[PDB]
Design a protein around this nucleic acid. Sequence first.
DNA 1: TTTTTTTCTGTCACCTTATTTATTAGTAAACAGGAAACA
DNA 2: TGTTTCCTGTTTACTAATAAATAAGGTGACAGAAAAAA
Lengths: 136, 135, 135, 136
Amino acid sequence: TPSMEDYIEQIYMLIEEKGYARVSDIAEALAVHPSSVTKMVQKLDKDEYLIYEKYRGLVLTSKGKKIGKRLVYRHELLEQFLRIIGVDEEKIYNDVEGIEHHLSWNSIDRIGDLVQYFEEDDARKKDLKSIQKKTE
Amino acid sequence: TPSMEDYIEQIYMLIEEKGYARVSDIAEALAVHPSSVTKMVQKLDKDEYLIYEKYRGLVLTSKGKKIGKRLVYRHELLEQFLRIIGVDEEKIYNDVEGIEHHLSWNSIDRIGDLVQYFEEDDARKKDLKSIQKKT
Amino acid sequence: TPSMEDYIEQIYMLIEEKGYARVSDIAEALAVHPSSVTKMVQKLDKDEYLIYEKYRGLVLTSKGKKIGKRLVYRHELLEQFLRIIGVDEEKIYNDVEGIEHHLSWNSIDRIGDLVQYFEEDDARKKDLKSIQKKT
Amino acid sequence: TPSMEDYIEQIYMLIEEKGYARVSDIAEALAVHPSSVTKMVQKLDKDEYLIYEKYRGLVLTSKGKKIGKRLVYRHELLEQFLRIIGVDEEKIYNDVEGIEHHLSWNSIDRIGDLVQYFEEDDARKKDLKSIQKKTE
DNA sequence: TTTTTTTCTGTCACCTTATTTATTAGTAAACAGGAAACA
DNA sequence: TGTTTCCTGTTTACTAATAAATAAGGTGACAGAAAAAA
Ligand SMILES: [Mn+2]
Ligand SMILES: [Mn+2]
Ligand SMILES: [Mn+2]
Ligand SMILES: [Mn+2]
Ligand SMILES: [Mn+2]
Ligand SMILES: [Mn+2]
Ligand SMILES: [Mn+2]
Ligand SMILES: [Mn+2]
């Protein structure tokens, strides 16, 4: 099930952004009651993804850092992919969070071929925009 | 919603392919126990997607067909997109059935424009492979 | 082929009505034991009138559709004939299912002209009723 | 049922045509092997319709001759009906023998009314004959 | 010489009984929370 | 803000029961021969 990965994603993003992994701010961001977060963090601490103390914040382990880096790579790739294709901003975030878990790594690899195709050249992007507008 | 769209999609595909949809066919197509299929047909009948006759069969109403056609169109379009981009053959069917239900129809339409950008010209499909090969 | 034409006739009607033909519904329609329905379905499958799938169902082929479409027209025409002529509605169905399989198509074609002769005017049917009401 | 009525019908027709009915005449009339005729004469002896002798012949009783004339009436009426509406002369007989056994007597009476309707006025036949060719 | 009955014996028509599969109806129980509590 | 303790539906199998579809056997009228009676 998909709900297992986003906690690692969020913990990584949070310790890079503000160095403060905590039970509070990862709850409202997911729009869930903090008791579910309390249960999940304690479930996955037992799988070596975390470092924890009864009155201290969380820290990532050696494997958690690189797993989270891959997750952030995937999320950041897909956001700019969808912007290149041209879906309006209001849609992008939840579209990415919807698909990011079900794509296999072969598809994430081959999407890298596609995103570079429209970024290392100026013209192909404008051809794609011309087609996009020709039947809007 | 996703979990009902899967059943509408599969029922439509079976009707289209062979003219009748059976509980024992939907169960394999979805890889579920048939009790779930019957308990879900008796749930789609009250939303008027289906006409359900107990121990006899089921049929799509005019509401159901209009949805099923769009669902199958989305399925084929996403498969063709992944095939144009070059995903491994065995993985395409696993990825498409995963992502398809979370995608807004807005991005489905924009993918429908992306697919024809490359379908328009034989040159582009290997210009892209010129990006691929230098990895 | 009287005994064989009835199955195709009823299967066509039942597909147009329900959307699917089931062995038990055919058995009730022809008023026979369902094993006699199975035994005849497996024969129509080898005469190529229909496609049969074991424990799954039936589909009419291009032969069977065009045959049954004509048989149903014959049925409706004979019902309309006996209803024009003044027979009480109890016995019309039994008479039709009795005679329809023994009439040649020349007879059917001329009965169509007779029915049209009576449906193109109103005075003709009342002269016919006026002769019935004294002979 | 067909094979039960047609022996009375054909025996009556032969008795009125020639004054006597042999077993061979019935076998040829129904196109069957004569032993099938004798084993049916056994079934009719049991039912009072006729008088039988082991090697001499058949004679209809007062019961048989009443029914046989009504069956001959049905035959002649249906033949005249099919001949009025324009069926080809060679097609008539085989169509009559097919339906005479399944039409109930109510339909036969109504068919008699229909035959009267055309036989009492010549113009109706001309109207029907015009429409009969209008679209061939 | 030609019918006209008595047996032989074959397909067949259709139903009864049994069997194999498919469909439906509860029971359960592990999940995913989540309303009150704390600190 | 950092968690704990019972509640509270959801989702899916599983196990039973219920019916539907199919196959293996019988009967038994109806032909069609081929001898036999006349
Ligand atoms: Mn996520
Ligand atoms: Mn993400
Ligand atoms: Mn689907
Ligand atoms: Mn799909
Ligand atoms: Mn019929
Ligand atoms: Mn009919
Ligand atoms: Mn007859
Ligand atoms: Mn006759």
